Amino acid sequence: SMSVKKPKRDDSKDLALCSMILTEMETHEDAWPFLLPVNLKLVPGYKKVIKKPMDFSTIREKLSSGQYPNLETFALDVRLVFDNCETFNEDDSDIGRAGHNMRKYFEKKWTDTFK
Protein backbone atom coordinates (compact mmCIF):
# COMPACT_ATOMS: atom_id res chain seq x y z
CA SER A 1 0.00 0.00 0.00
CA MET A 2 1.14 3.62 0.23
CA SER A 3 4.87 3.67 0.95
CA VAL A 4 4.82 -0.16 1.71
CA LYS A 5 6.21 -2.10 -1.26
CA LYS A 6 6.73 -5.84 -1.94
CA PRO A 7 10.33 -6.81 -3.01
CA LYS A 8 11.42 -6.01 -6.64
CA ARG A 9 11.14 -9.06 -9.06
CA ASP A 10 13.78 -8.44 -11.82
CA ASP A 11 11.82 -8.00 -15.10
CA SER A 12 14.64 -6.55 -17.20
CA LYS A 13 15.11 -9.73 -19.29
CA ASP A 14 11.35 -10.37 -19.78
CA LEU A 15 11.25 -8.72 -23.26
CA ALA A 16 14.14 -10.77 -24.57
CA LEU A 17 12.85 -13.95 -23.03
CA CYS A 18 9.28 -13.52 -24.49
CA SER A 19 10.98 -12.80 -27.89
CA MET A 20 12.86 -16.10 -27.58
CA ILE A 21 9.79 -18.04 -26.67
CA LEU A 22 7.88 -16.48 -29.58
CA THR A 23 10.75 -17.45 -31.98
CA GLU A 24 10.49 -20.98 -30.83
CA MET A 25 6.70 -20.97 -31.38
CA GLU A 26 7.09 -19.34 -34.84
CA THR A 27 9.55 -22.07 -35.91
CA HIS A 28 7.53 -25.07 -34.61
CA GLU A 29 6.25 -27.21 -37.51
CA ASP A 30 2.73 -27.03 -36.15
CA ALA A 31 2.70 -23.19 -36.05
CA TRP A 32 1.33 -22.90 -39.65
CA PRO A 33 -2.32 -22.28 -38.70
CA PHE A 34 -1.23 -19.40 -36.40
CA LEU A 35 1.49 -17.52 -38.25
CA LEU A 36 -0.80 -14.93 -39.90
CA PRO A 37 -4.21 -13.47 -39.22
CA VAL A 38 -7.20 -15.47 -40.43
CA ASN A 39 -8.46 -13.91 -43.65
CA LEU A 40 -11.86 -12.67 -42.57
CA LYS A 41 -13.03 -12.28 -46.22
CA LEU A 42 -12.36 -15.95 -47.01
CA VAL A 43 -13.29 -17.82 -43.85
CA PRO A 44 -17.05 -17.98 -43.23
CA GLY A 45 -18.14 -17.45 -39.70
CA TYR A 46 -14.75 -16.29 -38.32
CA LYS A 47 -15.46 -12.66 -38.07
CA LYS A 48 -18.77 -13.00 -36.21
CA VAL A 49 -17.78 -15.86 -33.96
CA ILE A 50 -14.22 -14.84 -32.91
CA LYS A 51 -14.51 -11.54 -31.17
CA LYS A 52 -10.75 -11.03 -30.60
CA PRO A 53 -8.69 -12.60 -33.38
CA MET A 54 -5.01 -13.12 -32.59
CA ASP A 55 -2.04 -14.62 -34.39
CA PHE A 56 1.75 -14.89 -33.96
CA SER A 57 2.63 -12.10 -36.47
CA THR A 58 0.38 -9.71 -34.57
CA ILE A 59 1.94 -10.73 -31.26
CA ARG A 60 5.41 -10.26 -32.80
CA GLU A 61 4.52 -6.72 -33.99
CA LYS A 62 2.98 -5.84 -30.59
CA LEU A 63 6.06 -7.15 -28.81
CA SER A 64 8.42 -5.23 -31.15
CA SER A 65 6.56 -1.89 -30.63
CA GLY A 66 6.11 -1.78 -26.83
CA GLN A 67 2.50 -2.77 -26.82
CA TYR A 68 2.84 -5.32 -23.98
CA PRO A 69 3.08 -3.67 -20.59
CA ASN A 70 4.20 -6.85 -18.86
CA LEU A 71 4.74 -10.57 -19.40
CA GLU A 72 1.15 -11.48 -18.29
CA THR A 73 -0.42 -9.44 -21.16
CA PHE A 74 1.92 -11.24 -23.57
CA ALA A 75 0.79 -14.63 -22.21
CA LEU A 76 -2.87 -13.55 -22.49
CA ASP A 77 -2.49 -12.94 -26.24
CA VAL A 78 -0.64 -16.22 -26.82
CA ARG A 79 -3.41 -18.14 -24.94
CA LEU A 80 -6.05 -16.21 -26.94
CA VAL A 81 -4.52 -17.73 -30.10
CA PHE A 82 -5.20 -21.23 -28.75
CA ASP A 83 -8.53 -20.37 -27.21
CA ASN A 84 -9.75 -19.07 -30.54
CA CYS A 85 -8.47 -22.18 -32.27
CA GLU A 86 -10.44 -24.41 -29.83
CA THR A 87 -13.57 -22.25 -30.35
CA PHE A 88 -13.55 -22.67 -34.10
CA ASN A 89 -11.96 -26.05 -34.79
CA GLU A 90 -12.80 -29.61 -33.85
CA ASP A 91 -10.23 -31.28 -31.52
CA ASP A 92 -9.84 -34.13 -34.09
CA SER A 93 -8.90 -31.90 -37.06
CA ASP A 94 -5.38 -31.10 -38.11
CA ILE A 95 -5.76 -27.46 -36.98
CA GLY A 96 -7.44 -28.42 -33.74
CA ARG A 97 -4.64 -30.90 -32.87
CA ALA A 98 -2.02 -28.28 -33.94
CA GLY A 99 -3.53 -25.84 -31.43
CA HIS A 100 -3.45 -28.32 -28.57
CA ASN A 101 0.15 -29.20 -29.36
CA MET A 102 1.23 -25.55 -29.51
CA ARG A 103 -0.54 -24.65 -26.26
CA LYS A 104 1.30 -27.53 -24.53
CA TYR A 105 4.59 -26.42 -26.10
CA PHE A 106 4.05 -22.84 -25.00
CA GLU A 107 3.02 -23.63 -21.41
CA LYS A 108 6.10 -25.79 -20.91
CA LYS A 109 8.47 -23.09 -22.24
CA TRP A 110 6.62 -20.50 -20.04
CA THR A 111 7.00 -22.60 -16.84
CA ASP A 112 10.56 -23.48 -17.58
CA THR A 113 11.55 -19.88 -18.31
CA PHE A 114 9.76 -17.88 -15.56
CA LYS A 115 8.38 -20.26 -12.83
From Swiss-Prot:
In which compartments does the protein localize?
Nucleus
Q: Which positions fall inside the Bromo domain?
A: 9-113
Q: In which tissues is it expressed?
A: Expressed at varying levels in several tissues, whereas a smaller transcript was expressed specifically in testis.
**What does the UniProt function comment say about this protein?**
Regulatory subunit of the ATP-dependent BRF-1 and BRF-5 ISWI chromatin remodeling complexes, which form ordered nucleosome arrays on chromatin and facilitate access to DNA during DNA-templated processes such as DNA replication, transcription, and repair. Both complexes regulate the spacing of nucleosomes along the chromatin and have the ability to slide mononucleosomes to the center of a DNA template. The BRF-1 ISWI chromatin remodeling complex has a lower ATP hydrolysis rate than the BRF-5 ISWI chromatin remodeling complex.
Q: Say which family it is in.
A: Belongs to the WAL family.
Q: How does the annotation summarize its subunit structure?
A: Component of the BRF-1 ISWI chromatin remodeling complex, at least composed of SMARCA1 and BAZ2B, which regulates the spacing of histone octamers on the DNA template to facilitate access to DNA. Within the BRF-1 ISWI chromatin remodeling complex interacts with SMARCA1; the interaction is direct. Component of the BRF-5 ISWI chromatin remodeling complex, at least composed of SMARCA5/SNF2H and BAZ2B, which regulates the spacing of histone octamers on the DNA template to facilitate access to DNA.
The name this protein goes by in its record? Bromodomain adjacent to zinc finger domain protein 2B
Q: Which organism is it from?
A: Homo sapiens
The UniProt gene name for this protein comes to BAZ2B
Q: Which residues of the full protein are shown?
A: 2054 to 2166 of 2168
